[PDB]
mmCIF file of C-alpha atoms and ligand atoms in Angstrom:
data_model
loop_
_atom_site.group_PDB
_atom_site.id
_atom_site.type_symbol
_atom_site.label_atom_id
_atom_site.label_comp_id
_atom_site.label_asym_id
_atom_site.label_seq_id
_atom_site.Cartn_x
_atom_site.Cartn_y
_atom_site.Cartn_z
ATOM 1 C CA UNK W 1 -0.236 4.409 16.521
ATOM 2 C CA UNK W 2 -3.091 5.741 18.659
ATOM 3 C CA UNK W 3 -6.672 4.795 17.750
ATOM 4 C CA UNK W 4 -5.652 2.781 14.687
ATOM 5 C CA UNK W 5 -6.337 -0.848 13.739
ATOM 6 C CA UNK W 6 -4.375 -4.016 12.982
ATOM 7 C CA UNK W 7 -2.844 -3.953 9.527
ATOM 8 C CA UNK W 8 -3.849 -6.606 7.047
ATOM 9 C CA UNK W 9 -1.154 -9.005 5.909
ATOM 10 C CA UNK W 10 0.900 -7.467 3.110
ATOM 11 C CA UNK W 11 -0.957 -4.150 3.501
ATOM 12 C CA UNK W 12 2.225 -2.105 3.861
ATOM 13 C CA UNK W 13 4.978 -4.208 2.256
ATOM 14 C CA UNK W 14 7.355 -1.209 2.217
ATOM 15 C CA UNK W 15 7.227 -0.968 6.056
ATOM 16 C CA UNK W 16 10.598 -1.324 7.739
ATOM 17 C CA UNK W 17 11.500 -1.695 11.403
ATOM 18 C CA UNK W 18 14.638 0.058 12.539
ATOM 19 C CA UNK W 19 16.053 -2.238 15.176
ATOM 20 C CA UNK W 20 18.870 -1.653 17.692
ATOM 21 C CA UNK W 21 21.292 -4.612 17.960
ATOM 22 C CA UNK W 22 22.103 -4.262 21.668
ATOM 23 C CA UNK W 23 19.939 -3.923 23.551
ATOM 24 C CA UNK W 24 17.417 -5.499 21.137
ATOM 25 C CA UNK W 25 14.717 -2.881 20.672
ATOM 26 C CA UNK W 26 12.546 -1.040 18.132
ATOM 27 C CA UNK W 27 13.919 2.407 17.425
ATOM 28 C CA UNK W 28 11.721 3.694 14.647
ATOM 29 C CA UNK W 29 9.806 2.940 11.458
ATOM 30 C CA UNK W 30 11.289 3.399 8.027
ATOM 31 C CA UNK W 31 10.336 2.452 4.443
ATOM 32 C CA UNK W 32 11.729 0.449 1.538
ATOM 33 C CA UNK W 33 12.113 2.625 -1.593
ATOM 34 C CA UNK W 34 14.239 0.171 -3.724
ATOM 35 C CA UNK W 35 16.026 -3.182 -3.238
ATOM 36 C CA UNK W 36 18.922 -1.411 -1.455
ATOM 37 C CA UNK W 37 17.569 1.860 -0.039
ATOM 38 C CA UNK W 38 15.562 2.599 3.096
ATOM 39 C CA UNK W 39 14.069 5.989 4.005
ATOM 40 C CA UNK W 40 13.559 7.197 7.604
ATOM 41 C CA UNK W 41 13.628 10.308 9.803
ATOM 42 C CA UNK W 42 17.076 11.806 10.501
ATOM 43 C CA UNK W 43 16.189 12.106 14.210
ATOM 44 C CA UNK W 44 15.884 8.301 14.418
ATOM 45 C CA UNK W 45 19.665 8.158 13.754
ATOM 46 C CA UNK W 46 21.004 11.511 14.987
ATOM 47 C CA UNK W 47 19.721 13.607 17.890
ATOM 48 C CA UNK W 48 22.602 15.136 19.964
ATOM 49 C CA UNK W 49 20.387 16.576 22.704
ATOM 50 C CA UNK W 50 19.741 12.955 23.829
ATOM 51 C CA UNK W 51 23.246 11.676 22.976
ATOM 52 C CA UNK W 52 21.844 9.780 19.980
ATOM 53 C CA UNK W 53 24.312 9.318 17.151
ATOM 54 C CA UNK W 54 24.090 5.765 15.744
ATOM 55 C CA UNK W 55 26.660 4.251 13.359
ATOM 56 C CA UNK W 56 25.876 1.594 10.735
ATOM 57 C CA UNK W 57 26.983 -1.262 12.991
ATOM 58 C CA UNK W 58 24.598 -0.345 15.811
ATOM 59 C CA UNK W 59 21.543 -1.035 13.656
ATOM 60 C CA UNK W 60 19.493 -3.516 11.684
ATOM 61 C CA UNK W 61 16.487 -3.081 9.458
ATOM 62 C CA UNK W 62 13.736 -5.705 9.512
ATOM 63 C CA UNK W 63 11.651 -5.883 6.355
ATOM 64 C CA UNK W 64 8.406 -7.812 5.651
ATOM 65 C CA UNK W 65 7.194 -7.841 9.248
ATOM 66 C CA UNK W 66 3.773 -7.897 10.761
ATOM 67 C CA UNK W 67 4.210 -9.027 14.372
ATOM 68 C CA UNK W 68 6.149 -6.467 16.488
ATOM 69 C CA UNK W 69 8.220 -8.841 18.698
ATOM 70 C CA UNK W 70 8.146 -12.222 16.935
ATOM 71 C CA UNK W 71 10.948 -13.376 14.721
ATOM 72 C CA UNK W 72 8.913 -14.072 11.536
ATOM 73 C CA UNK W 73 10.735 -17.017 10.107
ATOM 74 C CA UNK W 74 10.443 -17.462 6.319
ATOM 75 C CA UNK W 75 8.663 -14.011 6.016
ATOM 76 C CA UNK W 76 10.815 -11.182 7.348
ATOM 77 C CA UNK W 77 14.246 -10.398 6.061
ATOM 78 C CA UNK W 78 16.894 -8.760 8.293
ATOM 79 C CA UNK W 79 19.492 -6.545 6.607
ATOM 80 C CA UNK W 80 22.691 -4.833 7.732
ATOM 81 C CA UNK W 81 23.510 -1.230 6.853
ATOM 82 C CA UNK W 82 26.318 -0.371 4.484
ATOM 83 C CA UNK W 83 26.036 3.405 4.961
ATOM 84 C CA UNK W 84 23.849 6.085 6.625
ATOM 85 C CA UNK W 85 23.245 9.479 4.984
ATOM 86 C CA UNK W 86 21.680 12.307 6.989
ATOM 87 C CA UNK W 87 20.361 15.440 5.250
ATOM 88 C CA UNK W 88 23.189 18.091 5.517
ATOM 89 C CA UNK W 89 20.699 20.766 6.676
ATOM 90 C CA UNK W 90 18.696 18.606 9.085
ATOM 91 C CA UNK W 91 17.988 21.033 11.975
ATOM 92 C CA UNK W 92 18.235 19.027 15.197
ATOM 93 C CA UNK W 93 19.090 22.200 17.118
ATOM 94 C CA UNK W 94 15.746 23.871 16.594
ATOM 95 C CA UNK W 95 12.641 22.259 15.013
ATOM 96 C CA UNK W 96 13.682 19.053 13.139
ATOM 97 C CA UNK W 97 13.529 20.869 9.801
ATOM 98 C CA UNK W 98 14.501 18.423 7.044
ATOM 99 C CA UNK W 99 13.973 15.364 9.201
ATOM 100 C CA UNK W 100 15.101 12.851 6.562
ATOM 101 C CA UNK W 101 17.822 10.217 6.147
ATOM 102 C CA UNK W 102 18.693 7.344 3.793
ATOM 103 C CA UNK W 103 20.151 3.940 4.663
ATOM 104 C CA UNK W 104 21.959 1.839 2.053
ATOM 105 C CA UNK W 105 21.730 -1.908 2.647
ATOM 106 C CA UNK W 106 24.811 -4.125 2.449
ATOM 107 C CA UNK W 107 22.981 -6.444 0.009
ATOM 108 C CA UNK W 108 19.732 -6.138 -1.961
ATOM 109 C CA UNK W 109 16.656 -7.597 -0.217
ATOM 110 C CA UNK W 110 14.438 -10.001 -2.183
ATOM 111 C CA UNK W 111 10.921 -8.782 -2.879
ATOM 112 C CA UNK W 112 8.070 -11.074 -2.025
ATOM 113 C CA UNK W 113 4.389 -10.923 -1.093
ATOM 114 C CA UNK W 114 5.448 -9.129 2.150
ATOM 115 C CA UNK W 115 8.326 -6.951 0.873
ATOM 116 C CA UNK W 116 7.876 -4.389 -1.876
ATOM 117 C CA UNK W 117 8.935 -0.749 -2.437
ATOM 118 C CA UNK W 118 6.693 2.332 -2.258
ATOM 119 C CA UNK W 119 6.906 5.101 -4.839
ATOM 120 C CA UNK W 120 8.361 8.537 -4.297
ATOM 121 C CA UNK W 121 6.186 11.350 -5.587
ATOM 122 C CA UNK W 122 6.836 13.523 -8.596
ATOM 123 C CA UNK W 123 5.967 17.235 -8.510
ATOM 124 C CA UNK W 124 2.522 16.725 -10.052
ATOM 125 C CA UNK W 125 1.579 13.921 -7.723
ATOM 126 C CA UNK W 126 2.535 16.106 -4.741
ATOM 127 C CA UNK W 127 0.725 19.118 -6.107
ATOM 128 C CA UNK W 128 -2.351 17.064 -6.767
ATOM 129 C CA UNK W 129 -2.587 14.993 -3.566
ATOM 130 C CA UNK W 130 -1.062 17.186 -0.804
ATOM 131 C CA UNK W 131 -4.254 19.086 -0.140
ATOM 132 C CA UNK W 132 -6.064 19.830 3.076
ATOM 133 C CA UNK W 133 -8.807 17.241 3.650
ATOM 134 C CA UNK W 134 -7.100 14.553 1.557
ATOM 135 C CA UNK W 135 -6.304 11.528 3.690
ATOM 136 C CA UNK W 136 -3.062 9.628 3.921
ATOM 137 C CA UNK W 137 -2.154 6.495 5.844
ATOM 138 C CA UNK W 138 0.266 6.073 8.721
ATOM 139 C CA UNK W 139 1.606 2.703 9.888
ATOM 140 C CA UNK W 140 3.831 1.623 12.747
ATOM 141 C CA UNK W 141 4.584 -0.469 15.829
ATOM 142 C CA UNK W 142 4.729 2.464 18.223
ATOM 143 C CA UNK W 143 2.729 2.954 21.366
ATOM 144 C CA UNK W 144 -1.047 2.670 21.410
ATOM 145 C CA UNK W 145 -1.432 5.494 23.944
ATOM 146 C CA UNK W 146 0.544 8.575 25.007
ATOM 147 C CA UNK W 147 0.387 0.064 25.618
ATOM 148 C CA UNK W 148 2.256 -1.658 22.762
ATOM 149 C CA UNK W 149 0.663 -3.468 19.785
ATOM 150 C CA UNK W 150 0.915 -7.140 18.937
ATOM 151 C CA UNK W 151 0.928 -6.396 15.223
ATOM 152 C CA UNK W 152 1.582 -3.483 12.844
ATOM 153 C CA UNK W 153 -1.058 -0.766 13.217
ATOM 154 C CA UNK W 154 -2.638 1.475 10.590
ATOM 155 C CA UNK W 155 -4.631 4.725 10.717
ATOM 156 C CA UNK W 156 -5.851 7.055 7.928
ATOM 157 C CA UNK W 157 -5.549 10.772 8.710
ATOM 158 C CA UNK W 158 -6.471 13.896 6.826
ATOM 159 C CA UNK W 159 -3.899 16.489 5.788
ATOM 160 C CA UNK W 160 -4.474 19.778 7.650
ATOM 161 C CA UNK W 161 -4.568 23.407 6.453
ATOM 162 C CA UNK W 162 -1.213 25.078 6.973
ATOM 163 C CA UNK W 163 -2.524 27.994 9.135
ATOM 164 C CA UNK W 164 -4.192 25.454 11.417
ATOM 165 C CA UNK W 165 -0.966 23.448 11.704
ATOM 166 C CA UNK W 166 0.920 26.637 12.629
ATOM 167 C CA UNK W 167 -1.673 27.832 15.130
ATOM 168 C CA UNK W 168 -1.630 24.507 17.008
ATOM 169 C CA UNK W 169 1.985 24.867 18.233
ATOM 170 C CA UNK W 170 4.670 27.320 19.378
ATOM 171 C CA UNK W 171 7.182 25.462 17.178
ATOM 172 C CA UNK W 172 8.266 27.193 13.990
ATOM 173 C CA UNK W 173 6.796 25.223 11.040
ATOM 174 C CA UNK W 174 8.690 25.177 7.708
ATOM 175 C CA UNK W 175 7.756 24.376 4.129
ATOM 176 C CA UNK W 176 9.532 20.996 4.654
ATOM 177 C CA UNK W 177 6.781 19.905 7.053
ATOM 178 C CA UNK W 178 3.085 19.296 6.840
ATOM 179 C CA UNK W 179 0.666 18.225 9.581
ATOM 180 C CA UNK W 180 -2.155 15.740 9.604
ATOM 181 C CA UNK W 181 -4.942 14.614 11.914
ATOM 182 C CA UNK W 182 -8.539 15.164 12.861
ATOM 183 C CA UNK W 183 -9.784 18.380 14.474
ATOM 184 C CA UNK W 184 -11.660 18.199 17.834
ATOM 185 C CA UNK W 185 -14.938 19.027 16.043
ATOM 186 C CA UNK W 186 -14.421 16.261 13.444
ATOM 187 C CA UNK W 187 -14.973 13.612 16.133
ATOM 188 C CA UNK W 188 -12.763 10.830 14.713
ATOM 189 C CA UNK W 189 -9.292 10.418 16.215
ATOM 190 C CA UNK W 190 -5.848 9.028 15.383
ATOM 191 C CA UNK W 191 -2.154 9.806 15.528
ATOM 192 C CA UNK W 192 1.315 8.341 15.474
ATOM 193 C CA UNK W 193 3.083 7.886 18.789
ATOM 194 C CA UNK W 194 6.370 6.891 20.381
ATOM 195 C CA UNK W 195 8.125 4.329 18.131
ATOM 196 C CA UNK W 196 6.232 5.257 14.933
ATOM 197 C CA UNK W 197 8.603 8.021 13.953
ATOM 198 C CA UNK W 198 10.628 7.470 10.783
ATOM 199 C CA UNK W 199 7.778 5.477 9.197
ATOM 200 C CA UNK W 200 5.695 6.435 6.163
ATOM 201 C CA UNK W 201 2.679 8.685 5.513
ATOM 202 C CA UNK W 202 1.432 7.259 2.245
ATOM 203 C CA UNK W 203 -1.332 8.042 -0.241
ATOM 204 C CA UNK W 204 -2.865 5.990 -3.019
ATOM 205 C CA UNK W 205 -2.976 7.981 -6.243
ATOM 206 C CA UNK W 206 -6.447 7.873 -7.824
ATOM 207 C CA UNK W 207 -4.748 8.422 -11.210
ATOM 208 C CA UNK W 208 -2.529 5.352 -11.502
ATOM 209 C CA UNK W 209 -3.598 3.327 -8.430
ATOM 210 C CA UNK W 210 -0.060 3.378 -6.922
ATOM 211 C CA UNK W 211 1.043 4.124 -3.336
ATOM 212 C CA UNK W 212 3.299 7.153 -2.930
ATOM 213 C CA UNK W 213 5.202 8.113 0.210
ATOM 214 C CA UNK W 214 4.281 11.755 0.818
ATOM 215 C CA UNK W 215 5.518 12.070 4.377
ATOM 216 C CA UNK W 216 7.815 10.760 7.066
ATOM 217 C CA UNK W 217 6.499 10.589 10.623
ATOM 218 C CA UNK W 218 8.642 13.326 12.181
ATOM 219 C CA UNK W 219 7.298 14.814 15.424
ATOM 220 C CA UNK W 220 4.378 15.690 17.693
ATOM 221 C CA UNK W 221 3.498 17.204 21.097
ATOM 222 C CA UNK W 222 1.791 14.226 22.842
ATOM 223 C CA UNK W 223 -0.130 11.626 20.898
ATOM 224 C CA UNK W 224 -3.680 12.088 19.708
ATOM 225 C CA UNK W 225 -4.262 15.266 21.751
ATOM 226 C CA UNK W 226 -7.259 17.447 20.887
ATOM 227 C CA UNK W 227 -6.130 20.588 19.042
ATOM 228 C CA UNK W 228 -2.738 19.047 18.201
ATOM 229 C CA UNK W 229 -1.482 17.446 14.981
ATOM 230 C CA UNK W 230 1.298 15.128 13.925
ATOM 231 C CA UNK W 231 4.032 16.656 11.837
ATOM 232 C CA UNK W 232 5.505 14.882 8.852
ATOM 233 C CA UNK W 233 8.583 15.501 6.700
ATOM 234 C CA UNK W 234 7.522 16.787 3.222
ATOM 235 C CA UNK W 235 9.173 14.112 1.094
ATOM 236 C CA UNK W 236 8.733 15.715 -2.324
ATOM 237 C CA UNK W 237 10.435 18.980 -1.138
ATOM 238 C CA UNK W 238 13.593 16.992 -0.294
ATOM 239 C CA UNK W 239 13.571 14.698 -3.291
ATOM 240 C CA UNK W 240 16.517 16.398 -5.035
ATOM 241 C CA UNK W 241 18.606 15.492 -1.981
ATOM 242 C CA UNK W 242 17.259 11.913 -2.078
ATOM 243 C CA UNK W 243 18.072 11.622 -5.809
ATOM 244 C CA UNK W 244 21.556 13.138 -5.403
ATOM 245 C CA UNK W 245 22.481 10.627 -2.682
ATOM 246 C CA UNK W 246 21.161 7.643 -4.652
ATOM 247 C CA UNK W 247 22.728 8.802 -7.981
ATOM 248 C CA UNK W 248 26.131 9.322 -6.379
ATOM 249 C CA UNK W 249 26.294 6.480 -3.848
ATOM 250 C CA UNK W 250 23.991 3.864 -5.425
ATOM 251 C CA UNK W 251 25.034 1.367 -8.123
ATOM 252 C CA UNK M 1 11.211 5.396 -9.450
ATOM 253 C CA UNK M 2 11.244 1.604 -9.821
ATOM 254 C CA UNK M 3 8.809 0.465 -12.497
ATOM 255 C CA UNK M 4 6.663 -1.682 -10.204
ATOM 256 C CA UNK M 5 6.744 0.615 -7.159
ATOM 257 C CA UNK M 6 3.623 1.127 -5.046
ATOM 258 C CA UNK M 7 1.718 -1.921 -6.268
ATOM 259 C CA UNK M 8 1.252 -4.467 -3.516
ATOM 260 C CA UNK M 9 1.527 -8.179 -4.373
ATOM 261 C CA UNK M 10 -1.444 -9.037 -2.084
ATOM 262 C CA UNK M 11 -3.664 -6.160 -3.146
ATOM 263 C CA UNK M 12 -3.065 -4.162 -6.379
ATOM 264 C CA UNK M 13 -1.320 -7.000 -8.196
ATOM 265 C CA UNK M 14 -4.276 -9.366 -7.509
ATOM 266 C CA UNK M 15 -6.947 -6.650 -7.761
ATOM 267 C CA UNK M 16 -7.930 -6.977 -4.100
ATOM 268 C CA UNK M 17 -8.837 -3.870 -2.070
ATOM 269 C CA UNK M 18 -7.792 -3.485 1.571
ATOM 270 C CA UNK M 19 -10.395 -2.677 4.189
ATOM 271 C CA UNK M 20 -9.843 1.086 4.415
ATOM 272 C CA UNK M 21 -8.264 2.311 1.173
ATOM 273 C CA UNK M 22 -11.707 3.469 0.018
ATOM 274 C CA UNK M 23 -11.714 6.053 2.854
ATOM 275 C CA UNK M 24 -8.667 7.628 1.168
ATOM 276 C CA UNK M 25 -10.302 7.625 -2.308
ATOM 277 C CA UNK M 26 -13.447 9.225 -0.849
ATOM 278 C CA UNK M 27 -11.315 12.062 0.583
ATOM 279 C CA UNK M 28 -9.808 12.876 -2.853
ATOM 280 C CA UNK M 29 -12.500 15.312 -3.952
ATOM 281 C CA UNK A 1 10.672 -8.127 25.032
ATOM 282 C CA UNK A 2 11.567 -9.176 21.482
ATOM 283 C CA UNK A 3 12.049 -12.727 20.332
ATOM 284 C CA UNK A 4 15.675 -13.711 19.732
ATOM 285 C CA UNK A 5 16.767 -13.087 16.133
ATOM 286 C CA UNK A 6 19.243 -15.471 14.448
ATOM 287 C CA UNK A 7 22.800 -14.674 15.594
ATOM 288 C CA UNK A 8 24.101 -14.465 12.005
ATOM 289 C CA UNK A 9 22.374 -11.061 11.944
ATOM 290 C CA UNK A 10 24.178 -9.805 15.082
HETATM 291 CL CL1 L02 G 301 3.628 12.547 13.617
HETATM 292 C C1 L02 G 301 4.109 12.147 15.245
HETATM 293 C C2 L02 G 301 3.190 12.192 16.310
HETATM 294 C C3 L02 G 301 3.583 11.854 17.607
HETATM 295 C C4 L02 G 301 4.920 11.480 17.816
HETATM 296 C C5 L02 G 301 5.445 11.124 19.153
HETATM 297 C C6 L02 G 301 5.027 11.602 20.421
HETATM 298 C C7 L02 G 301 5.828 11.006 21.331
HETATM 299 C C8 L02 G 301 5.822 11.128 22.821
HETATM 300 C C9 L02 G 301 7.156 11.694 23.303
HETATM 301 C C10 L02 G 301 7.135 11.680 24.841
HETATM 302 N N1 L02 G 301 6.012 12.516 25.322
HETATM 303 C C11 L02 G 301 4.748 11.885 24.913
HETATM 304 C C12 L02 G 301 4.641 11.909 23.381
HETATM 305 N N2 L02 G 301 6.700 10.204 20.700
HETATM 306 N N3 L02 G 301 6.441 10.288 19.340
HETATM 307 C C13 L02 G 301 5.835 11.440 16.750
HETATM 308 C C14 L02 G 301 5.431 11.768 15.477
#
């Protein structure tokens, strides 16, 4: 996260670290959506252009964390993956369209002060809150500059008008993406960066005072560049896929 | 969705506000 | 770079 701040303790209890077993490194963010399901970006698991194609056994998820590198004894829980599901129409060949994936945990994680699921939006919540100007929140342990944080970082960023998103890049933008970030004339700054991808863009509904995951940190061109914006997977648009997977392969 | 989703034990459950959530509320015009 | 995690997890 560029130009963010240290998270408060328990501020993002759905935040998950995707962690490579060997060598031991942070791959991506992710989020806890139930006791056995974790949401992340498909490109965190599968990206053929870079010979990335992880299996379940290559990976761990670390839940309840604050410190990036410390093993947080008695706080964090580490879970093994039962099964990975990648969206069938995830477009790694072109523009990361449908950059979403689910991970089913071998066993349910226990909720606690530090571990708790975020909500997925319903159609009305999306309609109501996914508006230009409305701010969401992005969290992660990625780089501080286009170095690395001691603890989980947080930044609030406004959703951006679709024509402006489109006009900022040569990449083809789809209805399964939205962009967020400050304009050069707005003065304030902030973005995700390397290692933040797969984590959540969340909003707090003013109607029922619950946090909803509206986006997944998907891609950008640089970090916190003037006239550029971070692009996020539109979670509500893919929710039928999410629900299908969980209905069929969940217990 | 799970019944208790999106309500943080250290914030919503205890009626404590985090340091920047108000910035989000203020944007929801 | 990262602190050693318990080997049960690996
Ligand atoms: Cl939303 C968002 C914003 C930025 C990134 C983002 C940008 C980078 C690097 C890649 C190497 N060149 C420098 C930038 N990594 N992740 C991901 C997602």
